[PDB]
Structures are given as structure tokens and as C-alpha cells.
């Protein structure tokens, strides 16, 4: 089997991407944030505290003839961005773009933190990291990809995110028309539950490529590119007027700047992020100071190749017996 669905930026800045997911019988379509950095499929629901729902589409398990309460199971997740959610658990039928899993754990929110309520475009998250990170207790549950793997033509899914434009998540096949050149595969450590790999270095604009190992995660659920402070300082030093702002919480730069590109290594291959992908717009409405898309990972504990990086590439999440990650230019 295979599946294919279109993923669309939630706003004009590409702050996140949503992909429609069919849940239950008859189908309830929710637009979920496909997150290779977490392992829970959780949704706004008829159980969510009413004051915490503000425009999202909800899953109503009582209207699904295939939904079954998973007795005694609860979940609670806290994300690196400070957001959180929690609730109970159903099993139900879940389909993405033609690909169907029966018995998928659907984590129904009872509580969401304010940032989720404040974002009316995200109805929940579909985790695509390793099932070892799933938060359901007392019996951990499997991701959608983990449940679908055995049935897929190949045990893979691909992320092709657009810059200011729609893109595609494919399950079970590699679309050889979606990228240029070849796909370079690189090793993955699953010990932390993430798609964790080691970039071979970086360049800023037309500058000299610096060979240096950068360990980090391929995370479709994080907007920006978080890298070591030495690398981020080298990038922003090339932008006249850029500086790190403690009040804003990272590097800002004059909105009139033209940004240089940023290149990261995958083995001997190179992925080039165009400068425009690094512009996240005014820090506040009407400001002429703009927020940078490359930020220090220093307070995080891990480097994060988020959407800024991944949308420059066609990315293969290879779930073979020994998982690997593939990157191609596009």
C-alpha cells in the first residue's frame, strides 16, 4: 500500500504545516501537524475543555462507530516550545491520503495549553518519531507510521515541504520526480527516540564550507533551524545590522536586509537553504526589525533541523530494520 497527502503552510510565514487526516467512521477530517519530532497522535475533541477550543475542528469519538475507549489509558505531552496537552485515548480508523490503519491510538485532548488554543489552524499533531517516545500510559502506543509500516510497499515516508506553497507527505514510496540529483542517505541514532543524524558541516552564502560534525534531529514539527552558537553567529555576522536580542529571544535583523543562503552537509552532499527561507518577518506588527530563521540551540541541548532546513530538501525517513535518513536537493 501507499498514501500521499498535500501539506500546506498554516500562514504566510510557514510557521507550521497542516495535512488533512480522516479519523473514524464516518470520516471526521482534522488538519494535523505531522511531527517527526514526537510520537503521539493527539486531537482536539468533544472532550476538550470548552474555553480551550477556539476555532479548531474537533474529533467526536461518540459519533464514530469504530471508536473504542482504551480502558485506563491517558496521555500527557510537553513540547520543547513550552506547549502541552493531555487527555484519554481511543482506538479508531485513521487514514492519510488513501492509506488506512485500523486500531490506531487516537489521543483525545481534555486539556491543551494556550498556544494550541490560540492557533485555530492546527487540530492536533500526528507524531512520526519513534514509538519509544509515545506518552500513553500505562501501555505505550504505536505511531501511525509504525502501524502502517508492514503494509507499505517500502517502509518509508517522505517529507517535501514547500516554501510559501503546498508540499507533500508520501508513505510507502519515493517519488523520483520530486527531487533533482541523487538522494544521499546518512546514519540515524534512535537512542533518544528521534530521527537523529550528523550533518558534515555548513557554509554561509558563497563562503567556504566548514567541515564540522553537527548532531541534530530532523523535526518537521519545529519551525526554525537551531544550530550551535558558533555557527549561528557566523551566519548572522554576514547580515548588516543583525544582532542577538535578549528581549526578543534570538537574532533579529533589519527587514530591509537581503539574507544570504545557508548550506548544510549530508555526507559529501550539500543542501542549500535560500536566504529568503530565513526571513520570519517583523518581530511585532508594524516593526522594521525582523525575526531570524536560524537561531542558537545553546539553551536546547540538541540541534534541530526544523522546517527552515527540511523545506529546502526532499527528505526520506527510511524505517528499515536499521533506519536512515535521506536528503536530496529539489
Swiss-Prot record:
An example Gene Ontology biological process: proteolysis
This protein's UniProt keywords: Aspartyl protease, Disulfide bond, Hydrolase, Protease, Signal, Zymogen
The EC number(s) this enzyme carries: 3.4.23.22
Catalyzed reaction equations: Hydrolysis of proteins with specificity similar to that of pepsin A, prefers hydrophobic residues at P1 and P1', but does not cleave 14-Ala-|-Leu-15 in the B chain of insulin or Z-Glu-Tyr. Clots milk
Stretches assigned to the Peptidase A1 domain: 17-328
Annotated S-S bridges: 255-290
Group of enzyme by EC: hydrolase
Active-site residues annotated for this sequence: 35, 199
GO function term, MF aspect, one: aspartic-type endopeptidase activity
Family assignment from sequence similarity: Belongs to the peptidase A1 family.
UniProt-recorded name of the protein: Endothiapepsin
Originating organism: Cryphonectria parasitica
Residues of the full protein shown: 90 to 419 of 419
Amino acid at each position: 500500500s501507499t498514501g500521499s497527502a498535500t501539506t500546506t503552510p498554516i500562514d504566510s510565514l510557514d510557521d507550521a504545516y497542516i495535512t488533512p487526516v480522516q479519523i473514524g467512521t464516518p470520516a471526521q477530517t482534522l488538519n494535523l501537524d505531522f511531527d517527526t519530532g514526537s510520537s503521539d497522535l493527539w486531537v482536539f475533541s468533544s472532550e476538550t475543555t470548552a474555553s480551550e477550543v477556539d476555532g479548531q475542528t474537533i474529533y467526536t469519538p461518540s459519533k464514530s462507530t469504530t471508536a473504542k475507549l482504551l480502558s485506563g489509558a491517558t496521555w500527557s505531552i510537553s513540547y520543547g516550545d513550552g506547549s502541552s496537552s493531555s487527555g484519554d485515548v481511543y482506538t479508531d480508523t485513521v487514514s492519510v491520503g488513501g492509506l488506512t490503519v485500523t486500531g490506531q491510538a487516537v489521543e483525545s485532548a481534555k486539556k491543551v495549553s494556550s498556544s494550541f488554543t490560540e492557533d485555530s489552524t492546527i487540530d492536533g499533531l500526528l507524531g512520526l518519531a519513534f514509538s519509544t517516545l509515545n506518552t500513553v500510559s500505562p501501555t505505550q502506543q504505536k505511531t501511525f507510521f509504525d502501524n502502517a509500516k508492514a503494509s507499505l510497499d517500502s517502509p518509508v515516508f517522505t517529507a517535501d515541504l514547500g516554501y510559501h506553497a503546498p508540499g507533500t507527505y508520501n508513505f510507502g514510496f519515493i517519488d523520483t520526480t520530486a527531487y533533482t540529483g541523487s538522494i544521499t542517505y546518512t546514519a540515524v541514532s534512535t537512542k533518544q527516540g528521534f530521527w537523529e543524524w550528523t550533518s558534515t558541516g555548513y557554509a554561509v552564502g558563497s563562503g567556504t564550507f566548514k567541515s564540522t560534525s553537527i548532531d541534530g534531529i530532523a523535526d518537521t514539527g519545529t519551525t526554525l533551524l537551531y544550530l550551535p552558537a558558533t555557527v549561528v553567529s557566523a551566519y548572522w555576522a554576514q547580515v548588516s545590522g543583525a544582532k542577538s536580542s535578549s528581549s526578543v529571544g534570538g537574532y533579529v535583523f533589519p527587514c530591509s536586509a537581503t539574507l544570504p543562503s545557508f548550506t548544510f552537509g549530508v555526507g559529501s552532499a550539500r543542501i542549500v537553504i535560500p536566504g529568503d527561507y530565513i526571513d520570519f518577518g517583523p518581530i511585532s506588527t508594524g516593526s522594521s526589525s525582523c525575526f531570524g530563521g536560524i537561531q542558537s540551540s545553546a539553551g536546547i541541548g540538541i540541534n534541530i533541523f526544523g522546517d527552515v532546513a527540511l523545506k529546502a530538501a526532499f527528505v526520506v525517513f527510511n524505517g528499515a530494520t536499521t533506519p536512515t535518513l535521506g536528503f536530496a536537493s529539489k
